């Protein structure tokens, strides 16, 4: 799977597009934090010291949906193989309506090391009807996170969201 195989998707995938063992670079996300860039509020943070740890569910408030910009801090370790052109394409849908796709290129990845990246999400302006529907139907908003190293898919994580606070 390459970036061209996901950049036009109009629905959540019916399954994971790669197996865990496709992660030959041993990329392991060890911290993920999201902060509202307009208030400094930390909206979510997690650290670690059958899905297989690839699905996460979020519980945010209805105010999330009116945010302008969110900053995500990612920490990850990397194994001993050099990692070049590490890229995430992450696509968010409500009921299979594409809300936004974010395409992030990680900076340089130091092998055999903990690395950090900051991703800035600029939220799409959502119509009032969408925001009300997404608040009313928790977990029907979902995302696919597709991670590529040298244009090949190495990790695929899934998420779903509630805004029912």
């Amino acid at each position: 799977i390459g970036p061209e195989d996901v950049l036009g998707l109009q629905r959540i995938t019916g399954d994971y597009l790669c197996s865990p063992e496709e992660n030959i670079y041993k990329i392991d996300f060890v911290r993920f934090k999201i902060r509202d860039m307009d208030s400094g509020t930390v909206l979510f943070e997690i650290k670690k010291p059958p899905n297989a740890g690839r699905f996460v569910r979020y519980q945010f408030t209805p105010a999330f949906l009116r945010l302008r910009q969110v900053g995500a801090t990612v920490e990850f370790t990397v194994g001993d193989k050099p990692v070049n052109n590490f890229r995430m394409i992450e696509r968010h849908y409500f009921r299979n309506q594409l809300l936004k796709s974010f395409d992030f290129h990680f900076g340089f990845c130091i092998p055999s090391s903990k690395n950090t990246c900051e991703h800035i999400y600029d939220f799409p302006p959502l119509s009032e009807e969408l925001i009300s529907e997404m608040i009313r139907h928790p977990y029907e908003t979902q995302s696919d996170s597709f991670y590529f190293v040298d244009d090949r898919l190495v990790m695929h994580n899934k998420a779903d969201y509630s805004y029912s606070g």
């Binding site: 911290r31 740890g53 996460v56 990612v74």
Partner: peptide, 7 residues
């Protein structure tokens, strides 16, 4: 989805 792994 980076939040999945971090748990």
């Amino acid at each position: 989805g980076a939040g999945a792994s971090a748990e």
